[PDB]
Assembly symmetry: none
Homo-oligomer: 294 residues x 4
């Protein structure tokens, strides 16, 4: 698990704003601490303190620290930002990000926005992190007291547990803030993610419709229960995907009936055959896309 990250790091990470590569990597204060200085274009950018985990007391995590204030108006909001979080989310359940040098997020946080909805948090939100803790106080034994803790949900219970919690913080924030040009920049980000979750469902449904369409067509060896299961399942994902595309308010009520028959289509149509496997898989995907709506 240690060299999967260190291979894609010495490899280098491509961006329009300069490629990153390791400048100085070291094994940290303890057996499991590691300290990686990195470089963006020509310049030394930031230091990465990482953790593979040391079971059972320790979770695995990554901290990003000591960033380059010269690169403050270039980096944040770029391809480079988006790609670096996508990289780290593949190996780290928790992530710690210094917002000391980010002028937008510091400002935003302090204006009272929920940490997930901040400019910088909004991006980590998108990469599967749901839990958030904002440190502005260094609280004794921590140096560099301006960091965001973010965590991927433990369960599917916790992921919709937190999202509900975030919505209440969003409703509360909106009935507190008087800054109306900030309040929009968060409303649009809040809504836009609501929209992205629907569009994933819309595409999951699309590929499920075709995966069923081909199933009933070309799998002639199939029970009549299976031709009905997949047949109806396709018409459902249809109606749902229609309501998603029009961001209809009745759509999550639709997706709920589709998902329970989608999982029912999967369980009766799956098999060794690849057309069967794709029907089931595309049923499971669509099902997996609807949890943010339910």
């Amino acid at each position: 698990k240690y060299e999967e990250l260190l291979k894609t790091l010495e490899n280098g990470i491509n961006s329009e704003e300069g490629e990153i590569r390791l400048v100085r990597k070291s094994q940290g204060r303890f057996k499991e601490e590691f300290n990686f200085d990195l470089s963006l274009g020509s310049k030394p950018l930031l230091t990465l303190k990482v953790f593979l985990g040391r079971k059972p007391y320790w979770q695995p995590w990554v901290e990003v620290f000591g960033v380059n204030p010269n690169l403050r108006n270039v980096f944040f909001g770029s391809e480079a930002e988006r790609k670096l979080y996508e990289f780290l989310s593949e190996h780290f359940g928790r992530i710690f990000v210094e917002y000391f040098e980010d002028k937008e997020t510091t400002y935003e946080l302090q204006k009272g926005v929920p940490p997930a909805l901040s400019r910088l948090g909004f991006e980590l939100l998108k990469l599967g992190y749901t839990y958030f803790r904002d440190w502005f106080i260094p609280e004794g034994l921590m140096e560099g007291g301006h960091k965001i803790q973010a965590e991927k949900p433990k369960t599917a219970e916790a992921k919709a547990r937190h999202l509900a919690n975030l919505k209440k913080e969003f409703e509360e924030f909106i009935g507190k803030c008087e800054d109306e040009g900030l309040i929009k920049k968060v409303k649009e980000r809040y809504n836009f993610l609501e929209e992205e979750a629907e569009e994933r469902c819309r595409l999951a449904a699309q590929a499920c419709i075709r995966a069923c369409e081909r199933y009933l067509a070309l799998c002639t060896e199939s029970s009549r229960e299976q031709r009905q299961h997949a047949g109806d399942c396709a018409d459902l994902c249809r109606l749902a995907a229609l309501l998603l595309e029009r961001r209809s308010p009745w759509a999550p009520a639709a997706c709920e009936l589709a998902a329970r028959y989608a999982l029912a289509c999967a369980e009766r149509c799956d098999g060794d055959e690849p057309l069967e496997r794709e029907c089931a898989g595309a049923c499971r995907r669509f099902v997996a896309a609807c949890a943010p709506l339910l």
Copy 2:
């Protein structure tokens, strides 16, 4: 109203099993009682005690009594049976039918079947009668001791009110009877009516789709909530009606979500306008068609 019946009776009623004509007609015990002896082929068949009504204390009704036991294996289940009830349903809200000489229905009733689902009741069920009362007890108080009372529904509310009531009696009967060749002969009769019940829903949904289709189109004066309410409502009735036509097993699950939004479409789209009134009415109809499935 008196001579519309007596003209089609002296005219005679054609059947493959003999034509019926009046043999002896008389004006009964009271001003409004009438007693008609009838003949099938050569033989005197039965007596008809009829009532044009004597408002406001009296409903209009017909009793059939004193039937010919020689014609017991010829009549019941023929063209002749079907046509005689179709005739009477055109003038009589209530109908009283002696099942003393019918060996199949007596037997069936006794075996515990709901009166509507009996061999003989099943036919009166088809001719628009919904309410049923089975008299088997001439217990020291009652003359005319083996007769079925049947009645046409007062409202569209009562017709789906009763059909729901019948379904519960059908579910209860099915979890009580051990006679498995009777239990099928009722399931199949119930089934055919389930099939009639789906097609009513399918057509109710059809006329609802168009009633919404025209609403959003030609009622330009309508809120954007109303254009979404009726717009989505149509797509629902669509998916449902698809599953009904293919007698799909997932269809009642579909109709359930449609009905709850169909009643929601009605309440937000109804008004003085006829296009509004038809949207609501066609929403209510579809809703009224789905009660036999839920």
Copy 3:
């Protein structure tokens, strides 16, 4: 069934406004028609056309007709009114009452009040009649075209079916009428009956509490399940009866939990013993009082 009524009629019916007795009784136009002229104090008051029933086509009913207009401001609203309906409700499912000579009810009906809520209907409402039909048109074959039809509910399903229907007519009437001194005289009658139904429950609960109180006390031979069943049952009827007395809005929600345990107390505590029989009976009563709230 014929002489139970005719014995309490030749006996005479006591009132503060004069005693009624039969003046001329006769057997009517048909075998089952009967026509009874009656007398209040010295004077001939009204004629009663009655019906014991002639199964299975006929329900049993009583019509009151040809009343004394001199007794118009004396009778209506007296002890005499209340007692005469209480008498007739013991033998007649349906009742027909001429409102031609009643100046208050004619007026009220026409002002658009629901027939049950009229001055005269309100009293028949109290005596277990729920269904109502108001004849102002004589519709051909009826002489004296100013009569109220009233009927006792067929089931417990129909009694709360109709009461719900009446409430909607009451809400609709209240959003239509501009006569504000009539509108109160109906609001107070509507509310007052809501109140009387609660008070019956309150007293049914009271006698149930004591019937349980004595049970657990003096029936020492009783299971510990039974001492808990009746013990808890008493505490429930307590909390309920508290909320009823304060006409609390949360009371019907309370009565609902009490009733389901009241019927549970009955079924486990009943027996041959009279203290057992009274516990069960008082449990059933309380249960029977809560149906108007549920």
Copy 4:
């Protein structure tokens, strides 16, 4: 925070089975790791690896490891067990306990019992720990392969969140295990905690009754809806608390109606005022106590 524990450890911890004292204490692999060998009576018993916390990446925790298998039938279930967990719960949010040498718990865990309900877990459950993770797998990745993770709840929301989760695991376990002398040993342990859970509800209800009693009394500035909301709410918590004290079987049915009106009392009575805040808070508490029963 470091020497509060190390002062009560060098002091020594008294038990009927021998007093514990530190034999060899050392500062561990990192700045914040500490490794304490301890002694029970004459013998070296176990090693304690502790953590004061190193914010913000680190929670504070204690691991117990390398225990004495000779002391296996003496310790577990004694005064000594109970007291050691009570000590540690005062400084540690999380606790890691090796169950390698405990024959009862290993066995029990394996038999499929939820970790909290095990012999050893049941005790840590009592000391305010709610979350549980059972490590049995040192599968080629993990050192320290037979240890129980246990954690104190973050909120009052999480504590009844988890207890509900445990109940479902208890219901699931009970419908899976065929070992009937184990299944009782867990039912009885679960039962005692059910009994603790009712008494919490009883006291939550008590403090809620008084919090409402004072509200309606001394908050004279209050709507008449609020005086009814809190007034009735108190009478409910009354009836419930009565049934809890008698461990009545109808009590959870009672608590269910109370809780839904308790949360309704809170939402309409809460405010800036402390008497308002205590009414709402005591309503929420009672509500929070009833989740283990529902």
